[PDB]
Design a protein around this ligand. Structure first.
Ligand code: Q9U
Length: 113
């Protein structure tokens, strides 16, 4: 219920802030299915920040919830696949915490559009 171009500006900036939290660059490109062959036996919808960028620029996020849903998939897929005592699981918890705060801030800025 606002103009497209500003909303997308906000989502691009939000996506950059989320990517900045992935300091190890483990969430920034699809999981390499060539290196992890059992990945899709548990993960129904892989997600990553590059795919989110592509979706954003294809006009596939037209509300904040659709954007936040794909972010949440990045986190939940990693929590699902990895044991708790791993760097990967711990990284997803960190991203959930740090990324959640980025998202709330961005949602506020959207309410004003
Ligand atoms: C979020 C995430 N990112 C990656 C990744 C990026 S790059 C790369 N290269 C490799 N040779 N494994 N793995 C992984 C992951 C997991 O959840 C666990 C995992 C074993 C599927 C591996």
């Amino acid at each position: 219920e606002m103009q497209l171009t500003p909303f997308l500006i906000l989502l691009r900036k939000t996506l950059e802030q989320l990517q900045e939290k992935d300091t190890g660059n483990i969430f920034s490109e699809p999981v390499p299915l060539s290196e992890v062959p059992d990945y899709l036996d548990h993960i129904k919808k892989p997600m990553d920040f590059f795919t989110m960028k592509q979706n954003l620029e294809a006009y596939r996020y037209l509300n904040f919830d659709d954007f936040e849903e794909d972010f949440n998939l990045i986190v939940s897929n990693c929590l699902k696949y990895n044991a708790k005592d791993t760097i990967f699981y711990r990284a997803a918890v960190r991203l959930r915490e740090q990324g959640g705060a980025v998202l709330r801030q961005a949602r506020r800025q959207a309410e004003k559009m």
